[PDB]
Design a protein around this ligand. Structure first.
Ligand code: ADP
Ligand code: ADP
Ligand code: ADP
Ligand code: MG
Ligand code: MG
Ligand code: MG
Lengths: 536, 155, 192, 191, 518, 100, 48, 200
């Protein structure tokens, strides 16, 4: 110091540092603090958790990404775990809770190896070689399902659909949600059974009713009523016709005006009466254009005034207002129609086709929500989910979203594996076997990853209330006795550790992604030596 | 300069007003392009429609948004600027052989190296260094050296 | 009564210098010919309501109305228009094309006396084909707090007359029915 | 201290010429060039001057985006009017937009029907005045009871524009500062 | 290592379940007094402007009161959904869902049952519960006279809980006539409840017509006969054309005098087209200005101004006509009819009385009381009554109440508990014992015994009499068919499903995370 | 090295330019290391650190000579005369490889 | 004496109860009863 | 190279072209096909939407009969601007400025993909990849200046859509998608590659 103010970085006294062994203990214990939150949540016997936002709204979730997303944290090590769960949620949408407890399991076993004095790069290189070795083994042992016909391929989705719904609420009606989830993909799929578009199916929840009232409808959900409700609510098609002849327009019902600011000057009373004639003839020509086109229901983007209500009512033409542009993207794909810009380009080939249009109340005074249904298979399915609470229907959205994502993973060819703790133990005993001859300096590194993989079965043992040591001892001895590797921890109590019997299936791409994100983050956290943090 | 605003009384002017700006800007580039010019140094912001016809014939565009940065460049090639958008005079056109673009400091730079024939003035010195503070003091040393060369002219 | 300015957007353009003299002549003529047609119906008193978006009666128009001996009163509330038409029997006039003699009322004297620095405009005598006449009563006093209570004390007085004409019959007050009803229910209370 | 500043600060380009005989040429002409440059900036910024009657699609086109202006943070204030022909205050506020548009040419004045503004808007809440600036809403004003209601005047509207930062306090165009010529004539006589 | 920020309350221990369970018990006990016919009304003291509010419904109470517990929000939200869905039975969901968590508390503490086992028993117990209502229901659709009698008894049951327990005999006829008036339209917005303070509570009535809140403008008469009603939605007053860029290039003010005259000529021409219909009454939603008002006087047409858009829907259906605009084509357009129209006065504000209309697809109810709070309570009583009766038309099946609905569920639930031998039987018995408490609090509010009176109802049903229930006026068991009280199937299906799923929420919670307030 | 600035932006890196970029160094003599890191990062993009851990050793090695009576110009003349031979020596260490 | 600068004398019980700002809500119900007595009958607003 | 929060670093792949985020959801985006066998790229700069033409807006109209024609003229020229893009057979349309809903729906009917809201640095990378040129005027479009590639396929990458170009015979561009768990993982993979790419 020598008396002068010895300052280097701006805000010297505010920020701190941390190094040596104490920097590591702050990292591993920070992961254990987050792992204790996730450990009592994982598995079918888990428990939900309430996340209170600053605005007073709550969300009852038992998914690791939504928990960590709405969690106000200060430690940076947990903030990387917040993004790891979000990484698993965005792409695969399965195993968020796993990629946290598994990454913590690698971190917890790494704490013992740091005490022995192994360099962190040798620790990180050991998990990288062990992770690829486990992926290379699990890719050989899993079987392909593409040889079976379409009738049995539907059953494999039901195996994974019941797996994803369970462990979440929506696990009662889960037998119908599995059929509803599989029925959504039967309508929306490619003929070659590959690269299905997920953006065609959007999520839509409704606060009201009960879970039993939910059903399948192929159409669009609009949160609005028809214009001037004097007409009958449920419009029917003609006796002989191809359909209702849906019409969509991105032009409001008005006289044509320039987009630029204009100044229409009327210097005479004769020109003023022609403006009145021009005002009326445009509305007369407009309703005659849609009349000759044969449209029954009209969808307008930018709304219209009250003059067109009576012209549309007399001709038996329902209509709506303030339909957003995102919904028109959904209407054109569902009804297979083309959106015309204007009336001069109006033609009968661009109009859509759907079965029927109708509206119901759902209760007393809530709001009139529009419903559309198709008479055949189309490229659009809109799940109509009901719920007794706002948190129930909110959790049912992200639960069913993960269900469709798990089925989306199975659309990829030859990616199936039997989970239930079997995938963890079958990848664990081989790593310990390789260490016996690949000893080197990294012998304990393989043993750490072998013990870290087994923690997820022990996590299931804690939630199910069984003895962990007796469970892992029986599974390890059974895997050594017989090379059949589809036996896992069944916690739902149907008997049988065997499992194909218990109709459970996980995506193979989802399971290998667990150790990848876990190992890839553990390689990053172990590199940190200096921890500089500034004050808020 | 005083309230430049469109005025279109009928549809006949609406149809030709969009194409009139394209043909007008193109017609001004014909007199400029026929003189054999391949690079034009602009003094302020250039429009996109004018840029579309410049790079058609491969005419380079250079920005010099200041007064002194534009005056120093005329002394090299010896050109006489004119604010009109017409034909440059052949006597006033400058002479530059090559205009290269290479990586020196990681950023894009444009060079105007002349040759032994048709020498020029107001040359520059590429000063490379590691510390920006050392660049400042060495640069003022050139100003002191250039200031010493001034001492030979007057006495 | 004002210069022309429709609710629709407008913009007056003057191209020639001599047009300024013409429009200035036509502005007063637009007020003059409308006031000339008031003389044709010999209407002697005008009552204008509260004008919005512009002045009710232009100052240039008051010169034509003041020389022809016409009383002008503006800034009348909108809800009182039903009161004046019902009392005086005069139908309102929204346009000069419908301005006729049969729609106007009648009165014997419209005097504005000067007394105590407070003006009063009172109409004496009403005669018309009207089965629903009107009545008006002023209040005088020391200060506004007594004027307010004198109004509400009269409201409680008129409500008694409103009750008798509504429901026929009455009873003697002064604590009589409270003791009578208490005696009557006390007689029956021991039986139940 | 203020006596020296009032010579230049409290005089426009038209009033600065009065000090040509008393004050120094270099002292006066130095500030006149400064005030002349400020007048030229307002002329370039005067891209408006009449009410912009827009449709709902254009609502984004002309309002929010416009409020960004050059995006030099050349922001532009955009006064929107959710008009409704039935209400009394709406036609009053429409007249103020036409009068204010002719004076303040740099500020964009926008009008649109309230039925075409918000999905099923409450008619009782009309008229509504919104003020955008750089995409952000500076003021979501409610019906004109705050500004006198039915008795709203042009002086009250100009005072509101100063509060939101749309017009400077000492602007010569404001009626509060724009004293009549008869007022200044009497002051010089009684001085 | 505190990973969370400053001022972050987290509970990851037994106190989390205790804090979540005690919050529902506090919300549960708050509404125990409001259940039943003998229940006491509650009083709300607002924090802003001293605006009091008296209400018996638990949904309005819990939404108004502030509660920071996350468990309280679930009881608030399940009550809001029940209030919006059916409009009745909100306090039953609040007290039953809290009692299910109350009964589930001792299983967690005393017996040490897994939370997944308690919900698993409630799944099978709720399945057998709804199956009891499948066989216990009765369809009275074959006869309209019996269905007419069913709407009486449902009105007797719903209106008895509110302050109108004495006057329910008169409003039961008023309530059922409004439903038969609507003839199946379950939209509650088509009934205008005009609030009037003063007079006796039994002075309410239901006139065959639509009662306006406003009066005629200037000079139009009060009493008329054989009036043709025409409704319009367009401006009809100082027509501002659809493009606002219109202007007038005026060279002289004399020509502008013709332009303003032309605006009056087209308006005069528009009113001339109204007279082609040959009408005597004209109604428009926008407020009518002076100039078009005057032209109706010579034609002999009445004018009404400033009608609300929600009232135009009620006005069109009572009149039976149609809203007409663009009046060039009178042939295709339709208009209503009425026998007599007369202006009346109920209190200080005058109203317009319509009677003798052809269509009767809607109505208006005029309430009378003393305080605005009593009037308001009356408004929240007919809304809950008419909401249940409106859904009774689409859901004709009904269920007998008075403790018989909860007990016949428990009879089937207790039967199924034996065939699921193990530890799940205690959870299903807890679901059964939770249903016994609804008739218990109904007996406690009236000041009767909780054990002996429920024990008599227990023995009566197992003997083979599935029509026994509680009678509170005498304090003994009586037949429900003779007393005449019955609820709808959608109501009992809703409260059992809402209270069941509400118990599933706060049993699957172990950790409570509280971030900072904003 | 893990650094979090005042705006709560997390960053993980081991590059001499990136670490010194986020750290707002106010000391005047310490910003010479920031300049050579950006100068080395802008042109070559590698070994930014090896430039910093080397300049610090030369200045740390010049510390006891400054405590002695050695002037400043004598130390600079040694490095500036020695670095000329190091550049020529590295040209001999480097190869003229064209095969393969 | 009201909150603003207006002063008013009042013998009527309805106007007395109307101008008096009461903190207790049950006592505030008497303001509405006097309003109901004033609207229906218009006499005896204090006797009720 | 751009950022993609989400995914695992091992699943990356080499790309012979560009992959840019759309950053906007159009009304007729789903109607277009995602797979073209022989696509043709054409870069635009004109703003394809109904608005003011050249930095001003003032139109005087005296007769009401011409008021209908001046509006139809604006509808006539905007389709004339779009029809010149349609006649040359440009399957992919790209522009720095925004593209309105009117234009993207006109392209959506006859199987023509379009995109917008891209930076100038991204546009300069598109030209050198396809080997085309910039054309800020629809009238001066010719067939020779259109770029081509092998195939086109829009793929789901980290809950974000990217328009892939690959298989060109002569590509000047290399742009790989960096997927990772945390935002620092994708950042470290960028800086490590940016340091290694300068050395080679
Ligand atoms: N019904 C079931 N039977 C057996 N095992 C299950 C069942 N449902 C889920 N699991 C297992 O529980 C583990 C954790 O899944 P979970 O945490 O619920 O999914 P996520 O991590 O996506 O939220 C998985 O490895 C899976 O094999
Ligand atoms: N006179 C009566 N005799 C017997 N039971 C009654 C009587 N009046 C009401 N009840 C019972 O009291 C209950 C009242 O429920 P209610 O207060 O309407 O619930 P909520 O207010 O939650 O809708 C009904 O279930 C009904 O069976
Ligand atoms: N002249 C009188 N002599 C004796 N008693 C009277 C006389 N006038 C009124 N009363 C009694 O005094 C009471 C006055 O009530 P009042 O003050 O008029 O009530 P309010 O002011 O609320 O209308 C009446 O109920 C009546 O019995
Ligand atoms: Mg899962
Ligand atoms: Mg009830
Ligand atoms: Mg390096």
């Amino acid at each position: 110091e020598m008396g002068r103010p010895f300052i280097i970085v701006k805000d010297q006294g505010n920020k701190k540092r941390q190094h040596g062994l104490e920097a590591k203990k702050s990292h591993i214990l920070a992961a254990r603090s987050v792992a204790s939150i996730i450990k009592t949540s994982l598995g079918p016997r888990g428990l939900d958790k309430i996340l209170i936002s600053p605005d007073g709204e709550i969300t009852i979730t038992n998914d690791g990404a939504t928990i960590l997303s709405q969690m106000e944290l200060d430690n940076e090590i947990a903030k990387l775990l917040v993004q790891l769960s979000k990484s698993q949620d965005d792409e695969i949408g399965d195993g968020t809770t796993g990629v946290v407890v598994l990454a913590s399991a690698l971190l917890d076993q790494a704490l013992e190896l740091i005490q022995k004095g192994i360099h962190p790069i040798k620790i990180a290189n050991g998990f990288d070689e062990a992770a690829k070795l486990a992926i290379s083994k699990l890719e050989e042992t899993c079987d392909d399902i593409s040889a079976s016909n379409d009738e049995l391929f539907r059953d494999f989705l039901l195996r994974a659909a019941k797996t994803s719904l369970g462990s979440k609420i929506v696990s009662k009606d889960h037998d119908r949600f599995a059929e509803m989830a599989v029925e959504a993909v039967i309508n929306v799929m490619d003929k070659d059974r590959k690269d299905v578009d997920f953006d065609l199916i959007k999520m839509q929840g409704r606060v009201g009713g009960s879970i039993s009232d939910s059903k399948l409808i192929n159409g669009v959900i609009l949160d609005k009523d028809f214009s001037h409700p004097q007409m009958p609510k449920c419009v029917l098609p003609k006796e002989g016709s191809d359909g209702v002849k849906l019409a969509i327009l991105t032009c409001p019902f008005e006289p044509p005006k320039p987009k630029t600011k204009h100044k229409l000057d009327i210097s005479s009373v004769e020109e003023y009466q022609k403006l009145q004639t021009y005002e009326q003839d445009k509305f007369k020509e407009m309703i005659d254009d849609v009349k000759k086109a044969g449209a029954d229901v009209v969808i307008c983007q930018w709304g219209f005034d009250d003059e067109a209500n009576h012209l549309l009512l007399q001709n038996d033409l329902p209509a709506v207002r303030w339909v957003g542009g995102q919904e028109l993207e959904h209407i054109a794909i569902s009804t297979n129609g083309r959106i015309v810009p204007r009336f001069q380009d109006l033609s009968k080939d661009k109009l859509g086709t759907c079965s029927r249009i109708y509206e119901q109340e759902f209760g007393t005074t809530k709001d009139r929500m529009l419903i559309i249904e198709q008479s055949k298979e189309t490229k659009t399915v809109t799940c109509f989910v009901r719920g007794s609470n706002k948190m129930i229907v909110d959790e049912a959205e992200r639960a069913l979203h993960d269900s469709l994502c798990v089925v989306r993973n199975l659309v990829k060819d030859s990616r199936v594996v039997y989970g239930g703790g079997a995938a963890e133990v079958t990848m664990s005993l081989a790593v310990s076997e390789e260490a016996d001859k690949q000893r080197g300096i990294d012998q304990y590194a393989f043993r750490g990853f072998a013990q870290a993989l087994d923690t997820i079965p022990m996590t299931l043992a804690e939630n199910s209330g069984l003895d962990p040591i007796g469970t892992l001892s029986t599974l390890k001895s059974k895997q050594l006795k017989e090379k059949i590797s589809n036996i896992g921890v069944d916690c739902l109590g149907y008997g049988s550790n065997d499992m194909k019997e218990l109709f459970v299936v996980d995506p193979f791409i989802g399971k290998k992604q667990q150790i990848l994100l876990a190992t890839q983050l553990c390689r990053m956290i172990l590199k940190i030596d200096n921890v500089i943090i500034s004050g808020k | 300069e005083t309230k430049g605003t469109v005025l279109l009384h009928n549809a006949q002017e609406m149809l030709d007003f969009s194409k009139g700006e394209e043909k007008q800007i193109d017609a001004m580039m014909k007199e400029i392009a026929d003189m054999g010019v391949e690079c034009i140094v602009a003094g302020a912001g250039v429009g996109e429609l004018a840029l579309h016809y410049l790079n058609r014939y491969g005419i380079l565009v250079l920005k010099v948004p200041s007064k002194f940065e534009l005056r120093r460049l005329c002394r090299v090639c010896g050109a006489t600027p004119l604010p009109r958008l017409g034909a440059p005079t052949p006597e006033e056109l400058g002479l530059v052989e090559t205009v290269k673009t290479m990586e020196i400091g990681g950023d894009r730079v444009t060079v105007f190296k002349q040759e032994q024939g048709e020498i020029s003035r107001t040359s520059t010195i590429i000063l490379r260094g590691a510390t920006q503070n050392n660049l400042d003091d060495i640069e003022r040393a050139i100003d002191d050296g250039v200031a010493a060369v001034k001492g030979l002219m007057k006495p | 009564i004002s210069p022309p300015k429709p609710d629709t957007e407008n913009n007056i353009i003057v191209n020639d210098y001599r047009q300024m003299d013409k429009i200035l002549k036509e502005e007063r003529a637009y007020l003059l010919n409308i006031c000339k047609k008031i003389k044709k119906a010999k209407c002697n008193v005008l009552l204008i309501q509260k004008s919005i978006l512009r002045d009710a009666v232009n100052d240039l128009a008051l010169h034509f109305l003041s020389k022809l001996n016409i009383m002008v009163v503006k800034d009348i509330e909108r809800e009182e228009i039903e009161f004046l038409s019902k009392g005086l029997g005069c139908k309102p006039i929204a346009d000069i094309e419908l301005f006729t003699e049969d729609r106007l009322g009648s009165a014997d004297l419209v005097e504005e006396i000067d007394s105590d620095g407070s003006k009063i405009v009172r109409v004496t005598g009403i005669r018309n084909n009207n089965a629903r006449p009107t009545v008006s009563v002023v209040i005088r006093g020391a200060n506004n707090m007594i004027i307010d209570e004198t109004e509400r004390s009269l409201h409680d007085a008129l409500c008694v007359i409103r009750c008798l004409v509504k429901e026929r019959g009455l009873i003697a007050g002064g604590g009589a029915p409270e003791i009578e009803i208490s005696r009557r229910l006390s007689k029956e209370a021991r039986s139940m | 201290a203020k006596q020296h500043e009032n010579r230049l600060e409290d005089k426009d380009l038209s009033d600065l010429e009065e000090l040509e005989d008393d004050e120094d040429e270099d002292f006066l002409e130095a500030y006149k060039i400064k005030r002349l440059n400020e007048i030229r900036k307002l002329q370039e910024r005067s891209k408006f001057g009449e009410v912009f009657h827009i449709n709902k699609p254009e609502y984004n086109k002309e309002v929010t985006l416009a409020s960004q202006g050059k995006k030099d943070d050349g922001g532009v204030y955009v006064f929107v009017h959710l008009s409704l022909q039935s209400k009394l205050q709406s036609r009053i506020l429409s007249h103020l937009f036409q009068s204010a548009a002719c004076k303040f040419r740099e500020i964009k004045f926008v009008e649109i029907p309230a039925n075409r503004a918000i999905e099923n808007y409450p008619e009782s809440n009309c008229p509504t005045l919104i003020v955008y600036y750089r995409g952000e809403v500076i003021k979501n004003m409610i019906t004109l009871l705050e500004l006198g209601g039915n008795n709203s005047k042009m002086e009250d509207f100009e005072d509101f524009m100063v509060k939101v930062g749309a017009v400077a306090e000492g602007d010569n165009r404001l009626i509060m500062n724009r004293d009549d010529e008869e007022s200044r004539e009497e002051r010089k006589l009684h001085y | 290592v505190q990973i969370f920020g400053d001022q972050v309350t987290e509970e990851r221990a037994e106190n989390a379940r205790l804090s979540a369970f005690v919050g529902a018990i506090a919300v549960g006990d708050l509404v125990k007094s409001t259940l039943g016919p003998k229940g006491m009304d509650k009083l709300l003291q607002s924090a802003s402007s001293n605006t009091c509010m008296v209400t018996n419904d638990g949904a309005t109470i819990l939404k108004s009161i502030p509660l920071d517990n996350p468990a309280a929000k679930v009881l608030v939200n399940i009550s809001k959904v029940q209030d919006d869905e059916v409009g009745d039975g909100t306090t039953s969901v609040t007290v039953l869902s809290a009692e299910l968590l109350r009964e589930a508390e001792k299983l967690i503490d005393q017996s040490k049952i897994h939370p997944q086992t308690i919900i698993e028993g409630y799944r099978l117990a709720s399945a057998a519960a709804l199956d009891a209502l499948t066989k216990a229901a009765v369809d009275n659709s074959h006869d309209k006279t019996m269905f007419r009698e069913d709407l009486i008894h449902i009105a007797k049951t719903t209106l008895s809980s509110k302050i109108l327990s004495q006057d329910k005999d008169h409003f039961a006829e008023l309530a059922t006539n409004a439903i038969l008036r609507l003839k199946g339209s379950t939209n509650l917005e088509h009934i205008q409840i005009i609030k009037i303070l003063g007079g006796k509570l039994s002075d309410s009535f239901l006139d065959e017509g639509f009662i306006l809140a406003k009066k005629f403008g200037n000079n139009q008469p009060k009493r008329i006969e054989n009036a043709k009603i025409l409704i319009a939605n367009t401006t009809l007053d100082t027509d501002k054309v659809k493009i606002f860029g219109t202007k007038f290039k005026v060279d002289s003010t004399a020509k502008l005098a013709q332009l303003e005259k032309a605006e009056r000529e087209k308006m005069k021409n528009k009113i001339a087209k109204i007279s082609k219909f040959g009408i005597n009454t004209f109604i428009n939603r926008q407020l009518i200005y002076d100039y078009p008002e005057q032209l109706f006087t010579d034609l002999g047409i009445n004018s009404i101004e400033h009608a609300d858009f929600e009232g135009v829907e009620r006005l069109a259906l009572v009149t039976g006509g149609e809203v007409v605009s663009t009046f060039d084509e009178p042939s295709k357009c339709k208009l209503g009819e009425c026998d007599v129209i007369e202006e009346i006065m109920l209190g200080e504000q005058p109203f317009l009385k319509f009677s003798g209309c052809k269509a009767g697809e809607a109505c208006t109810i005029v309430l009378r009381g003393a305080t605005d709070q009593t009037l308001d309570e009356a408004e929240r009583s007919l809304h809950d009554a008419l909401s249940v009766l409106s859904q009774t038309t689409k859901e004709t099946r009904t269920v007998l109440g008075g403790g018989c609905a909860e007990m016949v569920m428990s009879k089937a639930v207790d039967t199924e508990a034996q065939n699921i031998d193990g530890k799940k039987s205690l959870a299903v018995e807890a679901f059964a014992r939770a249903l016994r408490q609804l008739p218990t609090i109904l007996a406690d509010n009236a000041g009767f015994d909780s054990s002996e009176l429920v024990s008599k109802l227990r023995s009566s049903i197992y003997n083979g009499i599935s029509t026994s229930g509680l009678d509170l006026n005498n304090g003994t068991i009586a037949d429900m068919r003779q007393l005449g009280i019955v609820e709808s199937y959608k109501l009992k299906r809703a409260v059992v499903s809402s209270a069941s799923e509400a118990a599933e929420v706060l049993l699957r919670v172990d950790n409570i995370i509280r971030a900072r307030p904003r | 090295i893990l650094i979090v600035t005042s705006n709560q932006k997390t960053t993980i890196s081991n590059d001499g330019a990136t670490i010194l970029k986020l750290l707002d160094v106010v000391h005047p003599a310490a910003k010479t290391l920031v300049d050579i890191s950006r100068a080395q990062d802008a042109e070559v993009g590698d070994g930014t650190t090896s430039v910093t851990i080397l300049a610090g050793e030369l200045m740390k090695e010049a510390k006891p000579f400054l405590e002695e009576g050695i002037s400043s110009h004598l130390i600079m003349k040694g490095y500036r005369k020695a670095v000329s031979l190091a550049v020529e020596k590295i040209n001999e260490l480097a190869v003229d490889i064209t095969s393969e | 004496k009201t909150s603003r600068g207006e002063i008013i004398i009042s013998n009527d019980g309805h106007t007395i109860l109307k101008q008096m700002a009461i903190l207790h809500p049950v006592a505030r119900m008497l303001v509405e009863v006097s309003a109901a007595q004033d609207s229906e009958a218009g006499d005896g607003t204090t006797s009720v | 190279i751009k950022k993609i929060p989400g995914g695992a670093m091992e699943e990356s792949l080499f790309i012979n072209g560009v992959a840019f985020k759309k950053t906007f959801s159009y009304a007729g985006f789903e109607q277009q096909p995602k797979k073209f066998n022989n696509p043709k790229i054409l870069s635009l700069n004109v703003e394809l939407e109904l608005k003011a033409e050249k930095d001003n807006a003032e139109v005087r109209v005296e007769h009401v009969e011409d008021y209908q024609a001046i509006v139809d003229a604006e509808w006539q020229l905007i389709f004339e601007k779009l029809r010149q893009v349609e006649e040359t057979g440009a399957n992919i349309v790209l522009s720095k400025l925004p593209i309105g809903d009117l234009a993207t729906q006109f392209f959506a009917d006859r199987n023509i993909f379009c995109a917008g809201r891209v930076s100038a640095d991204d546009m300069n990378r598109v030209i050198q990849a396809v080997g085309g040129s910039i054309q800020s005027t629809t009238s001066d479009i010719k067939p020779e200046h259109l770029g081509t590639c092998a195939l086109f396929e829009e793929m789901q990458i980290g809950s974000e859509r990217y328009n892939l170009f690959q298989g060109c015979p002569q590509a000047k561009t290399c742009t790989l998608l960096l997927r990772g768990g945390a935002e620092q993982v994708i950042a470290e993979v960028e800086r490590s590659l940016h340091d290694a790419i300068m050395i080679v």
